[model samples]
Structure formats: structure tokens, C-alpha cells
Target chain A: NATTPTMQSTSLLTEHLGYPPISLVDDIINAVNEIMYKCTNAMEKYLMQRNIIGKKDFSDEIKIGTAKLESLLENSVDKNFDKLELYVLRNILSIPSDLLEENRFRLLHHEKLV
Target chain B: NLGVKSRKTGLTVNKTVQKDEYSMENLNDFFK
Candidate 1:
């Protein structure tokens, strides 16, 4: 490693190129949400049209996108989209094993431990 | 394997009951 010459010959990009300089604009967060909305619409259609879900879900990237959409809907202002996601989840694929209160639970059955 | 490592051991005790029966006492007598 030689620290001798201060030569600058590399092409350094002063502007962001990969994902566009959208954050440099107003309502950056809104644009992000808009992209997510499009993602939600696209994936919803994909799921309904294909009617397929499976081994590794056939692709890890699909799982990633689907999971990201799920998360986005979860924290959204209106949970209509969240409801849609739940509907699809139930109709297409169908966590808590712990903390069951036997006193309250078995009451529904009209049975008790002997 | 280190010449089978004969650091073997055994157990011996006698605390079993006897009302009208007589046999080897305790659980360790089966090997004998």
C-alpha cells in the first residue's frame, strides 16, 4: 500500500443511480409507500391468477416481497389492505401454542379434568 | 483403546426386607 500520490482518476458518481435520487425530492416517504402500494397490487394479482403457493414457495424472492407487503399493510392507516392479505392467506394457504387458560378454555366444552 | 482401560468397578449393599423369604439381598446381587 503506497500512500504517496494524491491522484484522482476514478469515475465517482456524485448523483445516486441505483434507485434514483427520489429521497432528494419532497414526500420521499410517500413515494416509498406508493411503490409499496404498486407492489401490493401486483403481488395480489399474481397470487390470484396463478393460484399457486409451495416448496420454498418456488422462489425466495417472492416470499420476501410477499412478507414485506404483509408488514407494510400491518402498520398502515386503513387495514382494508390488511384484510385482503388475511383473506388471501386464509383462502390460499391455511401461532400460539402457549398460555392457554384451561379454566376458561374447557368451559366452552362443558368438560373438566378428572 | 488404551488396553480396554480396566478401571471397572462394582456395587454391594444389603437393605432388602425378609419376612418369610430368604434370597440375595439388595439390587447388586444379580451379577454375582
Candidate 2:
């Protein structure tokens, strides 16, 4: 898949410290493009179905999902992965001082393969 | 159904007329 190859190449480039970064940049843009398109399309569709079609059934769920999507859309627009990455990093940085215990615990232990 | 891959989330861009003040001239001017 494009995701795996791009991720591998980008990691290798960053590790070697000689990659010009254009390829990585393109991959990053593509990833952002895909996610933002998905989020935006989802939002627009949600609005239409909820409003025009009068589907009051999932309004609450859609509202909650839209709120979560806003952050992703903002980052995608800015083309700034740093902003999204900061969400995780902020929790990591706080882990030492233990202010983000629950978040860190979730990240570390929630999806253990074993 | 499980066969339906397209799930419409229905995020719509509002196309309804809010105000009747809009005209082709107004739109052209606005774009400019």
C-alpha cells in the first residue's frame, strides 16, 4: 500500500539525514489530502442528511463526530502535521510529570498485541 | 446492508437562497 511504502521511505530518509524531503513532503500532503477530503465529505453529507432529509436520528452522534473532525480539518488545511502530532506529543511530554496519566496509559496499554 | 460500501454522511454545502439580494452582477462584483 502507498501508506506503508511512504512511511518506510520517509522513516529511512529521516534516519539517513540526507533525504531532500520532497518525496516525504508529497506523501505527507497526500495523506492530509485524503484525510481532509474524507472528513469534509463526511461533514457535508452529515449536514445534508440531517437537515434536508430531516434525519434527526443520529444528530447527536454527527455533532460529536463533527467536533472531533474539526481539529483534523484545521490541521489538514494548514498542512501542518506538527499540530496534529502535538496532540500526542503534548500527552507524552506530560507523561513524565504525570499530568496525562490516563492518556498515556491508553496509548501505551490499550492496543497491546499480546 | 453489508454490500453497501457508500455510506452517505450527508455533509452538505447550503445552496438554498437565504436572501433575494443576489444577482449575476452582484456575484460577478463579489468575485472581483
Candidate 3:
């Protein structure tokens, strides 16, 4: 009686592959950063417009959130790799996307909303 | 459970290792 096992690789056949994409990780990091930054900008715009005073510059606040999110996400997907803690971070991050389309739809009232 | 949001659908870059561009189907598509 023995415990069951799971999962398995090869040699020689694994000689040399080309176009290894040395910076795919960098590419993903950049894409995620763009998403967070743009989302923050849109939300900030909506908030300020609703403020009635039309505040001068929320750029600082937007960048702050961008920085916070960038670091958190990088750690989650890159540093943590595989962890129970990574699970928790994604749930928290999911909060931001909830209001994205509602505000996205509301703001660009005439852009065809494609 | 009751989450909101969606994407246009594309693979994430860093975590994915893609096949080479020059496959049998790839060559067919080029000539076809």
C-alpha cells in the first residue's frame, strides 16, 4: 500500500529553443502598470468632476495609487509566484475592477463606448 | 462569486511560454 503520486520533464530533446523572450516578465509588468494607471486616472477624473469644485491636480493621488498597486501586484505575481497569500491579494485587487465599467460607461457618454 | 469585470482575452506574457512562430499550420496560413 503506497500513497498516490502526481505530475512529471525530458532531456536531449530539450536541447536549445530560440526566441526565448528575455523580457516577457518586463512586458507583463509594463502592461499591468498601464492598466492600473489608466483605471486610476479615469476614476480620479470621475471623482473630481463630481467634487463640484473641479480640483486642481489629483495626479499626485493617482500616482500614489499606481505606485501602491504596482508594488503589490509585482509582489503577488512575481515574488510570491505560488502562495496562499497570493490568493488573498487578488481578491482585494478585484475590488477596483467592480466600479470600472460603471464609471467607464458613465464618463465617456459620447465616445461610442467601444 | 458575483465578481465583476472582464478582459478582451489574451495570454499574460511573463508566465506564458509560447510556441515558435514557424509551425506547420503557420506555414500553411502564410501561403493560404
Quick one: best TM-score, which candidate? 3
What C-alpha lDDT do the candidate models reach, one value each?
A: 0.33, 0.40, 0.34
Candidate 2 lDDT by residue in tens digits, A14-92 = 4444553344444665687787768767775867476534534666666667777876667545534442232222222
Candidate 1 lDDT by residue in tens digits, A1-114: 101111110011112122222222224335556877787778866865554455234455666767877686646623333322222221221101121222324432343334
Q: Give DockQ per model, in order.
A: 0.00, 0.01, 0.02
Select the stronger candidate by TM-score from 1 and 3: 3
Name the TM-score of candidate 1.
0.23
Q: In model 1, what lDDT does residue A6 have?
A: 12
lDDT (tens digit, per residue) of candidate 2 on B1-32: 10111112221213232222322112222111
Q: What's each prediction's TM-score? A: 0.23, 0.28, 0.29
Per-residue lDDT tens digits of candidate 3, residues A81-107?
222122222222222333343553343
Q: Which stretches of candidate 1 lie over 4 Å from their true place?
A: A1-26, A52-68, A72-114, B1-32
Decide which is better by lDDT, 1 or 3. Answer: 3
Top candidate, metric lDDT: 2
Who wins the DockQ comparison? 3
Instruction: Predict model 1's lDDT versus the native.
Output: 0.33
Model 1 is docked with a DockQ of: 0.00
